[PDB]
Amino acid sequence: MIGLVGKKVGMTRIFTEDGVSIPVTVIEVEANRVTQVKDLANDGYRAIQVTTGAKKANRVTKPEAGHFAKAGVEAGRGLWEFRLAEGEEFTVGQSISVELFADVKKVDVTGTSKGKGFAGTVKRWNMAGQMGNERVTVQSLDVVRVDAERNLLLVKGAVPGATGSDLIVKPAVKA
Amino acid sequence: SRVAKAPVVVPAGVDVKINGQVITIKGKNGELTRTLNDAVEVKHADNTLTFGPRDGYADGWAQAGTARALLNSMVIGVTEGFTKKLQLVGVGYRAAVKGNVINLSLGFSHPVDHQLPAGITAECPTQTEIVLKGADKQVIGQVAADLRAYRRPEPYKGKGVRYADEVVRTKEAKKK
Amino acid sequence: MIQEQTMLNVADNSGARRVMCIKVLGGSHRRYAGVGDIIKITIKEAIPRGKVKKGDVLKAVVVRTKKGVRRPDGSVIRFDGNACVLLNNNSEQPIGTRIFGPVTRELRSEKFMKIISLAPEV
RNA sequence: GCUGAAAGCAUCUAAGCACGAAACUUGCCCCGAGAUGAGUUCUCCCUGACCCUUUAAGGGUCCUGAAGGAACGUUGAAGAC
RNA sequence: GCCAGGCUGUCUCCACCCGAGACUCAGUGAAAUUGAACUCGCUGUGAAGAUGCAGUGUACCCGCGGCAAGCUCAUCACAUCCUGGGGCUGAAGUAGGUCCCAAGGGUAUGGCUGUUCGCCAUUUAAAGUGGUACGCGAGCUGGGUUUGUCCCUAUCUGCCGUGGGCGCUGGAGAACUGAGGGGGGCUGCUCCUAGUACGAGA
RNA sequence: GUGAAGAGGGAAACAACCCAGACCGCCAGCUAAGGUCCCAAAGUCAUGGUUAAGUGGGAAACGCGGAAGAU
């Protein structure tokens, strides 16, 4: 229903009972804690800033420590935005599970593709450039399997990023 | 010009108010308001409505005539109302009506639904006949035109939606 | 599979022995052709009264692919070579009533309902 | 295309006054505040002293060295550097 | 001197690997050229394509990596070949003929030429007309013509990616709205409607 | 007549288009061509008319049309 940030773990084919095994990419989506709520009155638009995971005590800067303390959430390795669906805002310190995607059947996956080395002139312009490590959103991906008690998501096809790469899954607005 | 020189008789039960250039007419059906062009002057003229072109406007006469015609139509509407009848010629052309939406099927793979503006009542004495009642001629005419545009009168059989007082022409291939 | 100037085998009693691809259809400016695809082939060698004479131009369909084709269950059924059977634009029913070798189960198309009957070996 | 003349007819318009082509733009997604117009939100740190001058977007001296970064090591599905 | 056959990434399409360069580290280090350079695009003029003249727009300062504009690669107008809509039609419908608009997108493979062009076969929706010195030789084979090393540090302008310094007004760590820019927007077949409306029938 | 061998102002730039022949200097004024909405210094100046199309701000012959012009 709303976008959730997770981590890519792997991709395989889930053998169906009818021998139609489908390519499934595996995303671990821990309970994302809503760190802050961006509203029209203060931030000028409706959205929620959320985190997830854990940060080492040395890795947490004191400004970040205070930000998390105000948010009342465990220090997560990264922070991300999520635009609301103009339905309703969330409360500070709220943890979002994966049940929201349990009844969507269509999601879009945004992530950074695996980095590639020096892309010469022929590879880029056919100056030189680079490919990979770019935030792109592949759309029209249908969720295959959802396991809330295991925080496991299987999504059809392939998604940018290698094992352990952070990514986002949002409702399939485009059809 | 000629049409303008014709005060329109307002029957009993119709109230006319001239607020500057605005004309507000009330009757049995309901309220109506209409901002009149400044090129013509309209006075109460109890039991009538006299129009006088304003000096300094070359288009005064035609403007006054059009305003007189519109006020006459509004008076006739509010006092008794306007009725329009539409027939659906062709096999399988249904005119189901429910709520404030008219649903039609004129050979399309999907139903064609038209919304009814407020103050317009649709009735179906017969499934293939649809009657619209409205206080304003413009609204009833617009809804009827929207219904007719869904299926143009086919000029080989005269099918589709047609008006009761409208003649529909039809033709056939000459030789081949 | 098929590419430009591909060498195809023969799996019918039409008399063809060596059939060579000339053009690829089923898509404008297409590159290759698949098992369930229509291909353009001509004949190189014919029996004394072979149904196909050198330089013939008529359609055909590949029944077996050397590269192999996939299945929904992951099966990658593959054959020792490329086998193709000739087809005609009109009277699609091929002359050959016998097909050498087994055939896969992807021939359930609308026009391939009459070929599944043949090829007793699966 | 609903009423409709001027110009007792008529008419896409003069008054009231409606739809609509893949043609154009949003809508699909990516970069983007070096956007000098330099933007918005959250959080954290500094709460000393003295002297002089051309006496104010002033200067100098002793102490202090907060958060953060960089400095170096392991290095990476990050990289020519 | 000719023919038939087998024979490899020459190619459809190229994918990875092995050794030396290409990049950095510590040291050696010369060049052609050089009047001086705070060395932008477009429109117009100019001994005639202007980094320097009139008008206008953009761009923080300085580094590292080269395709090279100074057959491959593209760009711009419609004065439209198609995708095409809309008027007229000697338009019953498909299919068409003329005209107005539309450049968003596409606009081939072989045999003779060195060939632009030109002729024939095979397909598509078309295999378009022109400007860029038929655009492109300090990019590439010289095939004819017209000096067969196809010469002249890619020195410097322009070009993308990524960096060092600096300001957003005390400093710093994070999440972003967004002025604007970029990419592509193609298309065949079958099924229900339906062998239906329409159509004398076809 | 000009340049050649005459500067300078104007025509947006410009040597042959108009005005105008620089002894040097001074932070004064008046004129020639050209301008007096601004860029850029001057009247958003007075009166009598054309203009509804940006024709002005490019175009002949011909019955306002003719009219199609350069990233």
Tab-separated table of C-alpha atoms (C1' of nucleotides) in Angstrom, chain E residues 24-202:
chain	number	residue	atom	x	y	z
E	24	U	C1'	48.721	5.508	-10.107
E	25	C	C1'	53.311	5.082	-7.121
E	26	A	C1'	59.489	6.708	-6.653
E	27	G	C1'	63.513	8.817	-10.604
E	28	U	C1'	65.175	10.407	-15.898
E	29	G	C1'	62.685	13.332	-19.204
E	30	A	C1'	62.138	16.209	-25.933
E	31	A	C1'	59.735	17.556	-29.486
E	32	A	C1'	57.018	20.127	-33.999
E	33	U	C1'	54.037	25.553	-32.885
E	34	U	C1'	54.252	29.878	-30.128
E	35	G	C1'	52.706	38.172	-30.892
E	36	A	C1'	50.138	38.261	-26.617
E	37	A	C1'	45.323	35.524	-24.635
E	38	C	C1'	40.589	36.814	-18.851
E	39	U	C1'	40.583	31.392	-25.985
E	40	C	C1'	31.312	30.063	-25.277
E	41	G	C1'	26.608	29.167	-28.729
E	42	C	C1'	23.078	31.509	-32.162
E	43	U	C1'	21.468	35.527	-35.624
E	44	G	C1'	23.550	39.599	-39.110
E	45	U	C1'	27.839	42.102	-41.732
E	46	G	C1'	32.824	41.555	-43.034
E	47	A	C1'	38.867	40.097	-48.771
E	48	A	C1'	32.491	36.366	-48.254
E	49	G	C1'	31.182	30.076	-42.353
E	50	A	C1'	34.041	35.570	-37.058
E	51	U	C1'	36.577	32.736	-29.861
E	52	G	C1'	37.877	39.106	-31.042
E	53	C	C1'	32.566	43.761	-35.354
E	54	A	C1'	26.163	44.923	-34.036
E	55	G	C1'	22.021	42.126	-31.240
E	56	U	C1'	20.708	37.978	-28.017
E	57	G	C1'	21.258	33.489	-24.598
E	58	U	C1'	24.034	30.245	-21.454
E	59	A	C1'	28.035	29.340	-18.226
E	60	C	C1'	31.231	29.007	-10.309
E	61	C	C1'	37.561	28.612	-10.708
E	62	C	C1'	41.107	24.481	-11.835
E	63	G	C1'	42.276	19.189	-12.569
E	64	C	C1'	42.015	13.137	-14.485
E	65	G	C1'	39.961	9.795	-18.328
E	66	G	C1'	39.208	10.072	-25.387
E	67	C	C1'	35.478	9.069	-29.207
E	68	A	C1'	37.668	13.282	-33.021
E	69	A	C1'	32.911	18.071	-35.015
E	70	G	C1'	37.191	21.559	-35.255
E	71	C	C1'	32.646	2.730	-44.210
E	72	U	C1'	31.509	4.360	-38.942
E	73	C	C1'	28.961	8.649	-36.787
E	74	A	C1'	24.941	11.745	-36.859
E	75	U	C1'	22.413	16.791	-36.900
E	76	C	C1'	18.327	20.441	-38.876
E	77	A	C1'	13.422	22.376	-42.522
E	78	C	C1'	8.978	20.087	-44.454
E	79	A	C1'	9.052	21.880	-49.325
E	80	U	C1'	5.687	14.542	-46.010
E	81	C	C1'	7.474	8.171	-48.339
E	82	C	C1'	4.804	5.886	-44.319
E	83	U	C1'	2.623	5.635	-39.330
E	84	G	C1'	-1.319	9.291	-40.488
E	85	G	C1'	-6.502	12.737	-39.347
E	86	G	C1'	-9.822	16.108	-41.975
E	87	G	C1'	-12.469	18.851	-46.535
E	88	C	C1'	-13.966	17.262	-51.626
E	89	U	C1'	-14.718	12.645	-54.439
E	90	G	C1'	-17.189	9.908	-60.486
E	91	A	C1'	-16.416	8.110	-51.233
E	92	A	C1'	-22.211	1.791	-50.390
E	93	G	C1'	-17.842	-0.838	-46.737
E	94	U	C1'	-12.405	-2.680	-47.161
E	95	A	C1'	-9.454	-0.383	-50.632
E	96	G	C1'	-8.515	4.272	-52.880
E	97	G	C1'	-7.737	9.767	-56.159
E	98	U	C1'	-6.905	15.460	-55.058
E	99	C	C1'	-6.081	18.996	-51.380
E	100	C	C1'	-5.013	21.414	-45.544
E	101	C	C1'	-2.171	19.965	-41.143
E	102	A	C1'	1.269	16.970	-38.840
E	103	A	C1'	9.001	15.902	-38.261
E	104	G	C1'	6.574	12.571	-32.163
E	105	G	C1'	8.699	7.929	-34.578
E	106	G	C1'	10.594	4.936	-38.718
E	107	U	C1'	12.211	5.615	-43.618
E	108	A	C1'	16.121	-2.402	-46.078
E	109	U	C1'	19.052	-6.958	-48.084
E	110	G	C1'	21.511	-8.537	-52.731
E	111	G	C1'	23.548	-8.590	-58.373
E	112	C	C1'	26.341	-4.080	-62.529
E	113	U	C1'	29.311	1.388	-60.947
E	114	G	C1'	34.681	3.892	-57.934
E	115	U	C1'	30.441	5.801	-58.337
E	116	U	C1'	26.121	10.341	-55.844
E	117	C	C1'	22.657	8.903	-59.246
E	118	G	C1'	20.927	5.000	-62.340
E	119	C	C1'	18.559	-0.746	-63.776
E	120	C	C1'	16.497	-5.846	-61.842
E	121	A	C1'	15.066	-9.582	-57.682
E	122	U	C1'	13.210	-10.139	-52.708
E	123	U	C1'	10.017	-7.615	-47.888
E	124	U	C1'	7.845	-4.147	-44.961
E	125	A	C1'	4.275	1.058	-42.884
E	126	A	C1'	7.737	3.614	-45.746
E	127	A	C1'	12.906	1.898	-47.939
E	128	G	C1'	11.534	10.537	-48.716
E	129	U	C1'	13.359	15.353	-50.750
E	130	G	C1'	17.309	18.938	-49.385
E	131	G	C1'	21.332	22.158	-45.999
E	132	U	C1'	25.648	20.965	-43.090
E	133	A	C1'	32.016	22.705	-48.815
E	134	C	C1'	26.758	14.755	-52.373
E	135	G	C1'	28.311	16.813	-43.653
E	136	C	C1'	32.040	13.648	-41.754
E	137	G	C1'	40.256	11.793	-44.946
E	138	A	C1'	44.921	16.324	-37.761
E	139	G	C1'	38.005	9.519	-37.856
E	140	C	C1'	38.715	4.995	-41.605
E	141	U	C1'	40.081	1.293	-47.131
E	142	G	C1'	41.680	5.121	-52.229
E	143	G	C1'	37.976	2.420	-55.826
E	144	G	C1'	38.435	7.118	-60.520
E	145	U	C1'	39.968	11.674	-60.674
E	146	U	C1'	43.417	15.650	-58.694
E	147	U	C1'	50.292	16.359	-54.131
E	148	G	C1'	50.099	5.548	-54.102
E	149	U	C1'	54.012	7.219	-46.271
E	150	C	C1'	46.422	9.338	-47.203
E	151	C	C1'	51.256	13.599	-43.871
E	152	C	C1'	50.764	17.690	-39.821
E	153	U	C1'	51.423	15.628	-29.970
E	154	A	C1'	44.689	15.584	-30.395
E	155	U	C1'	49.170	21.313	-28.543
E	156	C	C1'	44.264	24.404	-27.871
E	157	U	C1'	37.807	25.372	-28.693
E	158	G	C1'	33.413	22.302	-27.971
E	159	C	C1'	32.000	17.754	-25.967
E	160	C	C1'	30.223	13.409	-20.968
E	161	G	C1'	31.574	10.991	-16.292
E	162	U	C1'	34.171	11.954	-11.916
E	163	G	C1'	37.223	14.976	-8.684
E	164	G	C1'	40.182	19.653	-5.594
E	165	G	C1'	38.742	24.917	-3.769
E	166	C	C1'	34.839	28.057	-2.643
E	167	G	C1'	28.992	30.171	-0.882
E	168	C	C1'	24.584	29.562	0.280
E	169	U	C1'	25.917	34.201	6.498
E	170	G	C1'	28.089	30.507	13.576
E	171	G	C1'	29.647	25.324	12.306
E	172	A	C1'	28.301	20.287	11.259
E	173	G	C1'	25.498	15.250	10.115
E	174	A	C1'	21.233	13.481	7.593
E	175	A	C1'	16.021	13.469	4.585
E	176	C	C1'	14.093	16.053	0.641
E	177	U	C1'	10.222	19.761	-2.072
E	178	G	C1'	11.778	21.005	-6.753
E	179	A	C1'	13.088	26.032	-11.736
E	180	G	C1'	14.959	22.958	-15.287
E	181	G	C1'	17.028	18.955	-18.267
E	182	G	C1'	16.904	13.357	-20.279
E	183	G	C1'	14.823	8.848	-22.234
E	184	G	C1'	12.129	6.309	-24.989
E	185	G	C1'	5.583	6.770	-26.554
E	186	C	C1'	6.615	1.084	-32.262
E	187	U	C1'	3.735	-3.031	-33.810
E	188	G	C1'	1.658	-8.272	-36.213
E	189	C	C1'	-1.894	-12.429	-35.086
E	190	U	C1'	-6.207	-14.807	-32.623
E	191	C	C1'	-10.773	-14.839	-29.500
E	192	C	C1'	-16.240	-12.695	-27.740
E	193	U	C1'	-18.842	-8.862	-29.828
E	194	A	C1'	-19.944	-11.259	-34.979
E	195	G	C1'	-20.521	-13.827	-39.703
E	196	U	C1'	-23.260	-8.428	-36.106
E	197	A	C1'	-25.023	-3.282	-37.709
E	198	C	C1'	-25.348	-1.785	-42.451
E	199	G	C1'	-26.174	-4.131	-47.008
E	200	A	C1'	-31.775	-6.070	-52.456
E	201	G	C1'	-27.916	-9.727	-52.922
E	202	A	C1'	-22.740	-10.084	-53.146
